[PDB]
Amino acid sequence: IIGGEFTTIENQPWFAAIYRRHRGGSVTYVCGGSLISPCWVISATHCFIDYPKKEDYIVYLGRSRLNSNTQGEMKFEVENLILHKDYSADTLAYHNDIALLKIRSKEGRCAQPSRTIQTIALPSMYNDPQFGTSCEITGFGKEQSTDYLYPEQLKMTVVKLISHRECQQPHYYGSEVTTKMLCAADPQWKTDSCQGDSGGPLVCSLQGRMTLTGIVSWGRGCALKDKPGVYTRVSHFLPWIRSHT
Ligand SMILES: N=C(N)NC(=O)c1nc(-c2cc3ccccc3o2)c(N2CCCCCC2)nc1N
C-alpha cells in the first residue's frame, strides 16, 4: 500500500496473510486474501500460478505483522487450491484473477472467529456501489514502487471507485479492463495498492454492510496518474464462488 495508514488485524479481521515454503524451509510472503467462510479464503490466481502446489503454502488469519507473530493468530495448511479455469495473463492485465484456498490446521480445524478473525460478506450478484464510492484496501504490499522490502505492519488506505467508461479511456487502460474488473484510485493518485497487495480485499459499505467488492489484481506501476488499481469484480463471480465452495 502506497500512502494510507498503518492498522491492525482488528480493522480488517477477514484479512488473510499467505506465504510459501522454499525447498530448504525458508518462508516468503506471497499475497493477501479474505476469509468469506470459516474454511475458505479468496485471493488472486496470479499469486499461485507459478508455484501451483498447495502443500507449498501457509495461510495466517488474525495477523497484523509480516515476520512477527500476533497474539491470537491461527496458522493453516491449504487443503484445496482452486485456480480459475479461464485465467490468462497479457502484458498488463490478469483475466479471471480469482482463487479459493480451503484452509485446515494440523489439528484439522477451520477458522474460529475471534476479535482478530471474522468473515466478510460477498456482494449480491451484479450489485456494486456507484462510481465515486469510497472503499478500503488492505495489505503488506510495498509502501513505494522502488522499495526492496515489504512493510512489517499491515496497511490500509481509501480509494474511489472509477466508472467502467472512465477506466476504458485510452490513456487509462483502454480495453485491458473488462466488466469482470473494477478500477479504483485516489483523486490525486497519491495512495494505492502495489506489489505484495494482490489477492487482498477491496471493501465497500453496500446496503450499509462491509462487503467484499474487489480482490487486488493489477495495475501499471503504483500510485501513477491515469493508472488506477484494477480489482477482480467479485459480484460477477458468485456462481463460480458458490460452485467451488
Ligand atoms: N493499484 C496499482 N496501481 N497496482 C497494483 O495493484 C499492483 N501493482 C503491481 C506493481 C507494478 C509495479 C511496477 C514497479 C514497481 C512495483 C510494481 O508493482 C503489482 N505487482 C507486483 C509484481 C509481482 C506480481 C504482482 C504484480 N501488483 C499489483 N496489484
SS (H, E, C) 109-120: CCCCCCCCCCCC
Three-point CA angle 40, 42, 43, nearest 5°: 145
136 and 70 housed in the same domain? no
165 and 111 housed in the same domain? no
Nearest of 219, 169, 233, 239 to residue 2 by alpha carbon: 219
Nearest of 11, 21, 135 to residue 64 by alpha carbon: 11
**Does 145 contact ligand 1 (Cβ within 6 A)?**
yes
107 and 174 housed in the same domain? no
147 and 78 housed in the same domain? no
Q: Which one-letter amino acid corresponds to residue 232?
A: T
Q: Which residue has the cell 505484495?
A: 196
Nearest of 81, 29, 82, 36 to residue 60 by alpha carbon: 29
- Is 95 a residue of the active site? no
128 and 138 housed in the same domain? yes
- What CA–CA distance (Å, rounded) separates 159 from 219? 14
The grid coordinates of residue 132 equal 465515486
Number of domains in the chain: 2
Taking the centre of ligand 1 as the mean of its atom positions, its distance from the CA of residue 109, in whole angstroms, is: 34
The grid coordinates of residue 219 equal 495495475
Point out the catalytic residue in the list 34, 43, 64, 198: 198
Q: Would you give the DSSP letter of residue 158?
A: E
152 and 109 housed in the same domain? no
Per the structure, the complete domain to which residue 179 belongs is given by: 1-12+120-235
22: how many CB neighbours lie within 10 A of its CB? 10
170 and 87 housed in the same domain? no
Beta bridge partners of 10: none
7 and 128 housed in the same domain? yes
Q: Which one-letter amino acid corresponds to residue 56?
A: D
- Is 198 a residue of the active site? yes
CB 200 within 8 A of CB 215: yes
Point out the catalytic residue in the list 64, 95, 97, 235: 97
Q: Whose CA is nearest to atom 24 of ligand 1?
A: 195
The grid coordinates of residue 131 equal 462510481
The minimum-distance atom of ligand 1 relative to the CA of 227 is 3
**Does 194 contact ligand 1 (Cβ within 6 A)?**
yes
Q: Which residue has the cell 494440523?
A: 106
Residue 149's contacts (CB-CB under 8 Å, 6 or more residues apart) are 142
72 and 89 housed in the same domain? yes
113 and 128 housed in the same domain? no
Nearest of 57, 42, 22, 106 to residue 237 by alpha carbon: 42
97 and 37 housed in the same domain? yes
Exp. method: X-ray
230 and 245 housed in the same domain? no
Taking the centre of ligand 1 as the mean of its atom positions, its distance from the CA of residue 26, in whole angstroms, is: 24
